[PDB]
Design a protein around this ligand. Structure first.
Ligand SMILES: *Cc1c(COP(=O)(O)O)cnc(C)c1O
Ligand SMILES: *Cc1c(COP(=O)(O)O)cnc(C)c1O
Ligand SMILES: *Cc1c(COP(=O)(O)O)cnc(C)c1O
Ligand SMILES: *Cc1c(COP(=O)(O)O)cnc(C)c1O
Lengths: 468, 473, 473, 468
């Protein structure tokens, strides 16, 4: 038995708030989860088409994963990274040999506890390998929240600052940590479009976003630029690049002698209907970062994978880095089980096929709803651009440069979410004009149908315009 | 089942060699140390070798290895979860916060609100962010030899040269490579270590008004840079990795100085927290209360990854008035919180703090005896299950390694006293030694037995015989 | 009776080689170029060789070399001074500020107060300090290829790769070194140059709303970083060292964008100031008024070292309410201020600004004729005595040096078209060329004669003949 | 005919204020100068025992210097640093061959226009030569005001910030420029003494301030520290180090492989009764910076002098640095004439002898005035430590960490200055509890007597409490 009234009391009183003021806050108790559902203490079932934070890839509370964790708990315990375990070694082997066995780039893995820690590690390694300070990121990128990872996060609304309650006159950024001269922000891949929706290219066929990135690196000196960090689909920032963007970035970093880090924390492990997001583009990175679907959130884990060449350099030195929980044997047992289930049950193909189905459903919704400007994605990771049906332009002018100071009653994705909730479906987004949709890789056709029906309903309400 | 061999450890060793990034060792020198299972204060190797761990890993398995009540509690949580992120409420997350604030610190008035994260470094990142936002000021003051974590923000306040995630050579001190760009935008002042400013008679120096010179100089730095731009002073009451104990008055004087200057005091309890020092928290030895503490390690006794920051009522009331745009995927992970809950409940119910206090007194008496027969023990200090032992050359009474806490791991371990001691102790099936070259750093579980303490001290005895013989050099 | 000036010029050259630090040249490639005296647009060597200077040194001797009225005025001030620092008042310092505000800019309401310093870089340092203090915000936005000076603060906003006080190799672009540590703490964003987004015809790209793409992305960057932490955008209306002219619409769009975002606009007039462009200031071509300008060069026409910053009435009123703890020894130097006063008085009385406009129109007609005869001229643009000429391969109409304004001085000058032009024109006793590899940057005194313009254009004619006669390749 | 009332009106209206609010500001017009005197429009003569900013070493309006400037103006004009002149080359030769002819360290000079610019250049060269970023400065050092030079200025009251009018209700440091991680602040010399004034030395005889500086460099890594920058007597910061401090810094930097930059902008050119301040200490630096006495403020000039080995390194590269007015030939003619006069008329020995006389005068004042706690100095550069006689402690607690937000009616050096002005003498200090006395190197015994008499009168007043 649980006193949920007491839980709510303690949650209100003793926990720090995020995104909501204490004034406006209402706790949202979840007593248990299963598959694509969250279950409230009263038994209310919610179909979660956020997949929490696009991170419960295998499905909620997988029985084989949970059984694997229980077995680990018969032996461990805790040992730190200086000590070797079967679970930690096997996890690395599964990634390099089993998942990426068809590719030549992978060298060595370091496990840590979170995706932000993975990005911190990737940044440190890239800089040490090149012996150079600068890293290039893009407008709207999200790469985590800790001090180093945040420097490459250029998503205004997710930088751990403070904003006001329904007033945008009160932005307070973290003093001493609100900009960083060791990072250059390049344009979003989506920045250079003409009035007809056509892509701008230079006379050599290079996308203008890539050409501008090249020029920034030339100006600062390629000799001081360690790496370009990307997301193949911006996750929190909610965007899909032109197809040619990632291949051209791979080519340009090669030409300039700069590393390419692709952040796979969100796109990794089947999320996009391939093992990794980069694999849609016929290229290979120098470093990837991992989290979320690495363990499908069963326990906290993150990881960095570096190329053979980078691993060979690191192997020649003593690296003076310690993280207490890095390599935690029970977390690694969860990772092994998660990856074994994904492989054995062909979760990646399930994702590919289900994305193809989602594409079909969104096509039909776009024909019925003029507030849908476009949609794109793959696997279980979709964006839907929301516009005013009458003007065909976004409702929120600041768009991906908005802050959470905004009243949610002015925000289309918040209006959509609140309405879809009436049908027992959690669906919406994190940007104001852009849906961000994701479920478990093994989500059923019936649950996709139920989600799309709730979205159908929310879009009817949005287009009625009676919220205004 | 028909299986008689669940794990092929030869295969594990090859994978570990081939596929895992090294730390502290080059690939060429690396000798893997596989651990198949743990229990209490013991690690068990796949060949059955049992090692008594007087490092308690990283001074972080406070409850003991593989506590059966904690592991059962984790298994129970797995009937229900699953994963929800911090926007959702769970019983385990809310109860964890309540145990800290109401139960453990119910006698204190400063505590306000907790944010849970996954590691001690993430806790420190969070504390720094909050201190800077609350004060609207950028600078944080740390101390020489402090260790506060490894991630970009936490590392800015880490001034322990050998633990800043840089690269050093294999038995050569000539190839230091620090991470390029890592101090761009750092907003940090390094104040003196507490143990700076000693006289030849070993006493810590004070001014005419009795202010320690370490504190007086910290005050001068804050005045010089402008108190109006200094958010916080961050401390460890006992430097963990840095391996130092401050004079008794240092922590009280830092509380006084920060109050007088209008600056916050963050005490980093990631290592000293949860009974490590024979009180619930390290700061409680000093009769003062901080504005913010950071936690990890003993928070879950390493059962699952957890960290936390606890802020004062004043700070929590401020943060409550704003929308805080900060997200961490695993922050508040319900299964991790179930582990914290169980760890803390066992700790409370079985009086682990008093067990630590009592065993510390017993350790003190064993070290007294060791100092009487070993001139290589210059001095020792500590409390609960956290001890430093200053090692010196018995004939000169001066440390062997000149750079001391400013050493790097570029050094050959065959020249390092704490490495010599460790290597010899292992012959007795005991892991004991330290992080710094001239200083032992000793810890075990809070419920460690008297027999296990005796076993470890006998091993140290044997190791010191060998150091003092000078056969190693 | 005749007191001959005792100068051994071979000894001077020896001393210059041995005792003075080199810039732009290695010691081994360096040959000193002694100049004994100057007059009007001419440099005179010790042997009496005369050189017509169509660089006007650094586009900075606006009034002409060794103007008798200015020099008499300096000699007069030396009857009285001496030196006093800025806490003391003099007639010369107060008059210089009055001339700028009430006699030059009396037709505009923005000007408030001046601070005099000794150099253009010092003026930019001061402007950055004031913009940040007034707004209480850290970030300043500059543009790719801007040059704003060389001192630590001014260099942060200089994004001209080849002019940031680093080291490059001798005819090798593989060994170089930027100054370590110089960008720790820098609070600067680099926005696109005004010329960055062009089409095949040469038109600058605009969005459907009519906003230049360069401006659009500048605004996006400010939005992303938070307009609440952006103090200012700093610009040059014509990139001086960077050698570029904006589309007419850029500056009005920047003025509008800054007003809309609540950000200051600093226009750097150190090069374009004081008649250089055929108006008093470069910004005056664009129908707008800035919040702050920086001055140097033509401020005194290099007669003595002076720089200045002029801030708006609203900025001045804010600064006036506080005690500003800033001192510079030579700021307001009374004899340098005497030079400024006389330079400006001569410029006004003899209508040099009007003379410069007229001569620019003349130069325009001369360049038109050169372009019709020389296919190596792709385009040219300018005003007054500041001209850019885009140099291209005559057959392709595209530039020879691909890195263009991102080149370094590591390049061999026998590969740089502007170096080739300079070397050839020298045979005709004319100094003319550029700072960037594909772009001429032409300037003389505001009172340059038609005969000297004709002589310079003749030498260029000769130079371009040789460039497009495939012999240098 | 000059209209000085109109001058005062223009000065108030059109010039930015420093140290004073507009509201409290009273302009102080100076019509001419001569020797150690400033002359007001009404003929009032003021004996200047600040020597402006300790920078008019030769005396005001030296006729030989002014004649030399006039001669240069018959030839120039302006050429920038790429061209050679007799004046620029001769100035460098005078410094290296004539003044420093007895020393082996000097290599090459770069002339610039100000002391701050000299410091900027020195920092750049030290960092390029070593290929290292960090520079160590000391608490209370003043090394100039420009962005780079200001990073090593750790004098709280002189960092180009804003403070209030007789209040603490408004205070503001420059955003983005109020600290710098590429600089480490080491302790001031005399860091801590024991209660009897004994210097704290370790078992190797190393002073505490030096030992701690060494520890900082070890902690940050000597491989990343370019230089230690010092003033042998802190000028604005108003302090004299123990004799052994500078020698031990020279020794320590050599042992650690770190450069020593000694900032001679204020102590240079006879100020201390030697050609350079460092010459009191039997050591040679790697780099010095120069200004002030370099031209005795006749025209703006600064300079950096680097060692033979540093010069040999820079000579191998193309250095992409331009400063328009660096090497200005008329400024260089002034430097030449200034240094020639100093040499020919033995101004350095004049300074030394007058320093000895000043010492005897201050000894007599201390016998008579218990508000004089101590005094020290050399040549024409002195400090006098002022204390409340009845408590034996300084009146202003914050001491060298004060700000100009204080009311000047509470500041001992302000009270002294105001009373001394009744005798037509300008004398006082920069810091609240410390006199900073300087005059021209050729100041007469009669003027020293007049200044000391005015100080005696001022100290009677201070000790009377009547100001309080
Ligand atoms: C969520 C995320 C991170 C950070 O992961 P955490 O586990 O939340 O620290 C980093 N990068 C990307 C692309 C992400 O989506
Ligand atoms: C170990 C430690 C940390 C960092 O904790 P991790 O969980 O290793 O990130 C922070 N502070 C102190 C005092 C520590 O001992
Ligand atoms: C020359 C120049 C400066 C710097 O002036 P200095 O007197 O050389 O310090 C600054 N801004 C611009 C636009 C310049 O052309
Ligand atoms: C005055 C001074 C400077 C700066 O000189 P300016 O000419 O005022 O720029 C630098 N260092 C010291 C020690 C000084 O006294």
């Amino acid at each position: 038995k649980i006193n949920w009234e007491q839980v709510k009391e303690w949650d209100r009183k003793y926990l720090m708030r995020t995104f909501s003021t204490q004034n406006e806050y209402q706790p949202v108790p979840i007593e248990s989860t299963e598959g694509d559902y969250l279950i409230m203490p009263d038994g209310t079932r919610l179909l979660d088409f956020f997949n929490q934070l696009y991170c419960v890839n295998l499905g909620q509370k997988n029985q084989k994963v949970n059984a694997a964790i229980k077995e680990a708990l018969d032996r461990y315990g805790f040992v730190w990274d200086t000590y070797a375990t079967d679970y930690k070694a096997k996890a690395a082997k599964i990634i390099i040999e089993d998942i990426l066995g068809d590719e030549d780039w992978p060298g060595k893995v370091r496990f840590v506890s979170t995706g932000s820690e993975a990005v911190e590690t990737a940044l440190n390694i890239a800089r040490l390998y090149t012996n150079r300070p600068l890293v290039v990121t893009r407008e709207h990128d999200y790469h985590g929240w800790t001090g180093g990872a945040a420097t490459v996060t250029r998503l205004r609304s997710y930088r751990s600052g403070l904003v006001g309650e329904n007033s945008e006159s009160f932005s307070a950024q973290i003093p001493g940590s609100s900009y960083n001269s060791a990072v250059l922000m390049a344009p979003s891949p989506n920045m250079f479009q003409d009035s007809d929706g056509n892509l701008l290219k230079d006379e050599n066929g290079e996308l203008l976003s890539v050409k501008y990135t090249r020029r920034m690196i030339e100006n600062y000196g390629p000799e001081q630029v360690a790496a370009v960090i990307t997301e193949v689909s911006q996750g929190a920032g909610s965007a899909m690049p032109p197809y040619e963007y990632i291949p051209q970035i791979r080519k340009m970093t090669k030409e300039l002698g700069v590393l390419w880090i692709n952040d796979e924390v969100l796109t990794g492990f089947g999320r996009t209907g391939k093992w990794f997001g980069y694999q849609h583009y016929g290229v290979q990175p120098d470093i990837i970062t991992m989290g979320k679907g690495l363990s499908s959130s069963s326990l906290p884990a993150g990881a960095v994978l570096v190329s053979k060449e980078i691993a060979a350099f690191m192997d020649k030195h003593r690296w003076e880095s310690v993280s207490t929980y890095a390599g935690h044997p029970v977390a690694m047992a969860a990772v092994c089980a998660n990856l074994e289930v994904m492989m054995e049950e062909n979760f990646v193909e399930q994702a590919k096929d289900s994305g193809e189905y989602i594409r079909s459903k969104l096509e039909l919704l776009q024909e019925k709803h003029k507030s849908i400007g476009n949609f794109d994605g793959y696997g279980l990771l979709w964006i839907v651009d929301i516009v005013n049906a009458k003007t065909k332009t976004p409702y929120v002018k600041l768009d991906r440069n908005f802050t959470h100071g905004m009243n949610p009653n002015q925000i289309p994705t918040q209006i959509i979410m609140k309405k879809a909730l009436e049908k027992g479906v959690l669906i919406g987004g994190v940007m104001p004009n852009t849906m961000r949709i994701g479920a478990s890789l093994n989500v059923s056709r019936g649950d996709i149908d139920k989600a799309m029906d709730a979205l159908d309903y929310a879009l009817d309400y949005l287009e009625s315009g009676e919220w205004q």
